[PDB]
Design a protein around this ligand. Structure first.
Ligand SMILES: CCCCC/C=C\C/C=C\CCCCCCCC(=O)O[C@H](COC(=O)CCCCCCCCCCCCCCC)COP(=O)([O-])OCC[N+](C)(C)C
Ligand SMILES: CCCCC/C=C\C/C=C\CCCCCCCC(=O)O[C@H](COC(=O)CCCCCCCCCCCCCCC)COP(=O)([O-])OCC[N+](C)(C)C
Ligand SMILES: O=P(O)(O)O[C@@H]1[C@@H](OP(=O)(O)O)[C@H](OP(=O)(O)OP(=O)(O)O)[C@@H](OP(=O)(O)O)[C@H](OP(=O)(O)OP(=O)(O)O)[C@@H]1OP(=O)(O)O
Ligand SMILES: O=P(O)(O)O[C@@H]1[C@@H](OP(=O)(O)O)[C@H](OP(=O)(O)OP(=O)(O)O)[C@@H](OP(=O)(O)O)[C@H](OP(=O)(O)OP(=O)(O)O)[C@@H]1OP(=O)(O)O
Ligand SMILES: O=P(O)(O)O[C@@H]1[C@@H](OP(=O)(O)O)[C@H](OP(=O)(O)OP(=O)(O)O)[C@@H](OP(=O)(O)O)[C@H](OP(=O)(O)OP(=O)(O)O)[C@@H]1OP(=O)(O)O
Ligand SMILES: O=P(O)(O)O[C@@H]1[C@@H](OP(=O)(O)O)[C@H](OP(=O)(O)OP(=O)(O)O)[C@@H](OP(=O)(O)O)[C@H](OP(=O)(O)OP(=O)(O)O)[C@@H]1OP(=O)(O)O
Ligand SMILES: CC(C)CCC[C@@H](C)[C@H]1CC[C@H]2[C@@H]3CC=C4C[C@@H](O)CC[C@]4(C)[C@H]3CC[C@]12C
Ligand SMILES: CC(C)CCC[C@@H](C)[C@H]1CC[C@H]2[C@@H]3CC=C4C[C@@H](O)CC[C@]4(C)[C@H]3CC[C@]12C
Lengths: 570, 573
């Protein structure tokens, strides 16, 4: 039933062009039926053309399967050699070997699914052609060629699977098949695995509660402690989580193998539904805290505990040691954060750079944390922490840019490729220069030093430079657009995965606008350029920054899947 | 990966005992492996015993398959004869063609069920014998499968596939004028039972509506804590939403326990509402109800009177049930409209299971009708201040007894149709006890105002008939609706020989709740029908009506279970 949709869902994206073109055959058959008027000879010519196309597709499938089988055999040979060397040596090496064996088993299972689906598609398309043409020649062709095709009559893959299982059990697992087939099973992958019904119900419940609480908050607002600054970080984090769930959904639908790019376990992937559930729960907590602050239902309890607890809970949620509430994902995130914040002492993989960029787009959270620290230290001259700026504010603002710059320097050291890493480092240090000049101008504003205009002009120049640098890097390098190989997709690259180019153009325009918007937001937040409306401008701009980062994540992951722009894979 | 769960979720419940006992074989193999210590002799003995059980199961499967194949052949012959007669005959003809098409679809579905039975039994045999071979590290289970299972009649007979082909041909030729696509659009059988999970968007909508409902309920409670009787106006809506939610739970429980309500209710198996859709409808209606009540409490718009908010809600509900367009569950809405029309005109239609079941549901939802009549009285008179809440009249009693009247007339029609007096007349008397209780309560209430001197006699008669009605309804529920307290109980004390639900504690708690809430239901009907409690009657009725809905929910559970097990309602040949 609807074999085309099932095939499309179960097709491995990396081999999309190497599967059976079921839709093309369906379109050919329908066009032939529509154009049928001499009738017998026309039908004979159409049958000949269809058989030729089927033969071409069968040859393509056979050659692809043969090459993949040879690759699998070579991989098995090298893995066996590595296992023999490890045995001759006789813990971490054993773990790495087990991971490699699981990956090889996944590749074998993918090959088996490829051959099975190709055979099923051949059978289905031949049956459909026979039904439409009211002729039995399709079954004869299938039996003559497809039934005896090498891709369908090769059991070398099942034998490889059996040998891999036996080797894993006897050597790595110490002769117990029960331990094997776990981490070595390859459950349903991709869109072929519907999310749990309970997860979807929880996502819906959290979304509804969040919507109602947001409506209540809006009505209450329309009808001692700065709540905007405190809650902006939480709101931005919740928005980022929701937009990241959307990013994951789009990557799964667009065929972008973000699992491989992020070096995540293919057998256990946190679905977009789980991200939506986490975002909804965090938003529910955030809304409850804000409502409690507005109303103060408990008189004895102070108001300040309401935010402090909320974020604290989130912290306790992230650093929870109990194996519950996405414990594996939380531990992976904690390790990634530790690597990122200690960037110069670790290998900069794709995940580290991506999370550093996310932090760069989430510097408002760090700024709000520093502002809260200042408010607690001093305010508890009115508003001293807001009217006057200091160096620590600038350093906190530049911390994400510092992390990215040091990551780029480490990448340059590792690979010695000057051009990309050094250009990116300059593109991140433009931020240091801009923030430094803005802080100098703000500090000199209070004390007339006769050089305020010089610093203002320097800040404007470096603002323009940084905005142009970031925009050019995003459009040309992160997204790979404006390439010279665009045969038809003007201002884009030759290959695009997303259905519409209008998405690409809208993303280009929104990035152009929002890079300047975010640069303005950084300039306002890190100093006192606009003490009157600065807070509201930053609050309005930060969600726009998160949205820009979400679109950038979309297109950067697309480019990474299409091309090794980040050079994170051999 | 786990054939036990797949088999349990894919077995046809009506044939539950006719499938391979995969779980029993698993337990047997595990026990034998655990007791393994001489050793080879014990292994051989266990293998012999296990294979003897295998032959017994294979013989059972073959016999059942042969019986069902003979039944299918006879059904096909009868359908062919009927179709030939109809063709030779050529508004009644249109109905005859529709009925023949439905019968052919049902027979094709039975053929698909038999084919699924065959495939599942073969897969279970192969998977259990493979597990036995792996456990015993011997290549003999596969040999026995090849020698016996692979050559058994239930797997060496292709007559079911041939019958399926002939059914397709006949439906496509002499019932569809040669349009094969039209035939396959109705004969093809999608997954059944819990095989197909509900759509993700439907579950998300259910969750969203549940969350909105919860938050709005919390807001309503907070507003209440910190010109129009709102309790008597919104009780009907709240009870209807609760009843729909509990009905979704009932459908989920029937699906999980294997109670084939799709066949009991004569619903279309190829497409029927799941518990998720009922939850979604209940959540949306609850959202609307909560919004209306919040608008009443706050009145955000001053130009719009408060009375507009309730009415519109209920109006929308009506518009949500009689919507001509095919937009929102139109199939189920039209089926419910037809069932309601049949129930409210009971003495002119044959009483099927669905009609009696819906009449009973209404019997448990009489509070809605009472509230509607009270609001009619309020609008007629109040708009003595509280004249419609201080005295009782005949129309009030008639409205209270309307559902009981429908059930009683249905029982009388069933007696007139089947001519068996015992069950139908006992049930008719059970329902007429409600008439007697209501009328005596009304007489006492209307006589308590003037010194007729016969008030205490009416009060005593009302007490006697209240006890009589409570006992009658309880005995019918326990002995004639749930099929409990039977003489065939071997280990399920106070229950029947076969119980489909996992826990007997459920049955015991259901009996206790049935007793308590039957008495509560009788008390609430007495209080609401007439003055009786003139100050606390409304609160007691409001508290008890949800309890009546819960009682009707448990009763639905156990009545459907008993109907699936035994033909208690005699709605099937
Ligand atoms: C000042 C710092 C501000 C906080 C830092 C910023 C953001 C934190 C949140 C998310 C960033 C990580 C996104 C990774 C996306 C990769 C693509 C994908 O979606 O793939 C997912 C990534 O899932 C993850 O691992 C983690 C996802 C994030 C879960 C959210 C946790 C709570 C967030 C709130 C933090 C509270 C902080 C308090 C405030 C300071 C694959 O999931 P898996 O289960 O296969 O994971 C791998 C597990 N193996 C390797 C065992 C299979
Ligand atoms: C006294 C005042 C009014 C009292 C309340 C009235 C009615 C509610 C009671 C029961 C609803 C039916 C429950 C289904 C029982 C069978 C099991 C099952 O789940 O069967 C369902 C039937 O679904 C239903 O019928 C609909 C479910 C109920 C939805 C509620 C709609 C809104 C109601 C508004 C209330 C109006 C009052 C105005 C306010 C004052 C299977 O669906 P299918 O699609 O297979 O249907 C068969 C369709 N073929 C045969 C063509 C394929
Ligand atoms: O008679 P119909 O027209 O109602 O259904 C036929 C046809 O539909 P069609 O006319 O193209 O719309 C098939 O394609 P389809 O609509 O699902 O869709 P796609 O074009 O592939 O997207 C359908 O499923 P499938 O072959 O694609 O999986 C298949 O069902 P069924 O007997 O169960 O086949 P089995 O899987 O059990 O072998 C029937 O094939 P025939 O046996 O040759 O008559
Ligand atoms: O499977 P591995 O062998 O590659 O890695 C496993 C290993 O951790 P390592 O990497 O060596 O530090 C286990 O510790 P270990 O050596 O004492 O014992 P074992 O021989 O494995 O039993 C640990 O506890 P445990 O679960 O097995 O008891 C388990 O945690 P995890 O399932 O998350 O947590 P739970 O929710 O199940 O508690 C790891 O599972 P993965 O990370 O999913 O692979
Ligand atoms: O756990 P492992 O990996 O060491 O061995 C598992 C494997 O047995 P294997 O080696 O082929 O003999 C599964 O077969 P599989 O999917 O490959 O399929 P094929 O039949 O070959 O196509 C079998 O599933 P099942 O399909 O028979 O239902 C599963 O049974 P389990 O979950 O208990 O479920 P049930 O007993 O309730 O059915 C076994 O697990 P355990 O018995 O728990 O240890
Ligand atoms: O349920 P039914 O079979 O007893 O009755 C069907 C009948 O109309 P009715 O309801 O009896 O007045 C169809 O046309 P008809 O009179 O020529 O007679 P036949 O039934 O063919 O003899 C009608 O087709 P249409 O014009 O809408 O496409 C279809 O409408 P609708 O529910 O929207 O269903 P869909 O077709 O959109 O799926 C009805 O449901 P179904 O066929 O089950 O689907
Ligand atoms: C602000 C103005 C100028 C432009 C705003 C354009 C926004 C709406 C554009 C920018 C990038 C776009 C996204 C790019 C990729 C995908 C993945 C696809 O599988 C679904 C649509 C989705 C999620 C797009 C939705 C629309 C989108 C978010
Ligand atoms: C407090 C007392 C008096 C109420 C009576 C006990 C209630 C809790 C009992 C009575 C009947 C019971 C139900 C009977 C049948 C099923 C179907 C099963 O698949 C899941 C549990 C479920 C849904 C039970 C839940 C508990 C239940 C509702």
């Amino acid at each position: 039933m609807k074999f085309a949709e099932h095939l499309s869902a179960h097709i491995t994206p990396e081999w999309r062009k190497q599967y059976i073109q079921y839709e093309a055959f369906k379109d050919m058959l329908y066009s032939a039926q529509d154009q049928a008027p001499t009738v017998k000879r026309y039908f004979a010519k159409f049958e000949e053309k269809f058989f030729q196309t089927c033969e071409k597709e069968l040859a393509k499938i056979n050659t692809f399967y043969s090459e993949k089988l040879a690759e699998a055999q070579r991989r098995f040979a090298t893995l066996q050699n590595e296992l023999q060397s490890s045995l001759d040596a006789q813990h971490r090496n054993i773990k790495d070997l087990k991971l490699a064996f699981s990956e090889f088993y996944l590749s074998l299972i993918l090959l088996q699914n490829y051959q099975n689906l190709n055979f099923t598609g051949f059978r289905k398309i031949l049956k459909k052609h026979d039904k439409i043409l009211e002729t039995s020649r399709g079954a004869d062709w299938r039996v003559a060629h497809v039934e005896v095709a090498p891709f369908y009559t090769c059991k070398k893959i099942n034998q490889l699977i059996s040998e891999t299982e036996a080797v894993v059990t006897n050597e790595l697992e110490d002769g117990d098949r029960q331990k094997a087939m776990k981490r070595l099973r390859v459950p349903p992958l991709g869109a072929a695995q519907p999310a749990p019904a309970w997860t979807t119900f929880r996502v819906g419940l959290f979304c509804g509660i969040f919507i109602v609480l947001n409506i209540t908050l809006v009505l209450a607002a329309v009808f001692i402690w700065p709540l905007i600054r405190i809650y902006r970080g939480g709101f931005l984090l919740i928005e980022f989580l929701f937009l990241l769930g959307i990013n994951t959904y789009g990557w799964r639908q667009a065929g972008v193998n973000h699992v491989l790019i992020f070096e995540l376990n293919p057998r256990s992937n946190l679905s977009h539904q789980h991200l939506f559930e986490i975002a909804g729960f965090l938003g529910i907590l955030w809304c409850l805290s804000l409502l409690a602050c507005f109303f103060a239902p408990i008189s004895v309890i102070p108001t300040y505990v309401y935010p402090l607890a909320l974020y604290g809970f989130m912290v306790f949620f992230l650093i929870n040691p109990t194996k519950t509430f996405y414990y594996k994902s939380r531990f992976w995130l904690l390790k990634l954060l530790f690597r990122v914040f200690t960037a110069p002492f670790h290998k900069v993989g794709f995940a580290d750079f991506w999370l550093a960029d996310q932090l760069n787009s989430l510097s408002v959270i760090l700024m709000d944390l520093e502002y809260m620290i200042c408010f607690y230290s001093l305010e508890l001259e009115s508003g001293i922490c807001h009217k006057y700026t200091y160096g620590v504010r600038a350093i906190v603002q530049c911390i994400p840019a510092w992390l990215r710059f040091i990551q780029c320097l480490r990448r340059y050291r590792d690979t010695k490729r000057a051009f990309p890493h050094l250009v990116n480092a300059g593109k991140y240090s433009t931020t240091f220069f801009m923030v430094t000049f803005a802080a100098l101008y703000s500090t000199h504003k209070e004390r007339g030093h006769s050089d305020t205009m010089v610093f203002f002009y320097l800040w404007i120049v470096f603002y323009i430079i940084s905005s142009c640098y970031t925009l050019i890097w995003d459009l040309k390098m992160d997204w790979g657009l404006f390439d010279k190989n665009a045969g038809e997709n003007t201002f884009l690259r030759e290959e695009i995965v997303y259905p519409q180019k209008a998405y690409y153009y809208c993303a280009i325009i929104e990035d152009v606008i929002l890079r300047f918007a975010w640069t303005i937001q950084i300039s306002i937040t890190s100093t006192t350029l606009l003490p009157h409306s600065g807070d509201i401008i930053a609050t309005v701009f930060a969600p726009l920054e998160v949205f820009r980062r979400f679109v950038w994540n979309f297109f950067r992951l697309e480019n990474e899947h299409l091309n090794n722009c980040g050079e994170f894979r051999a």
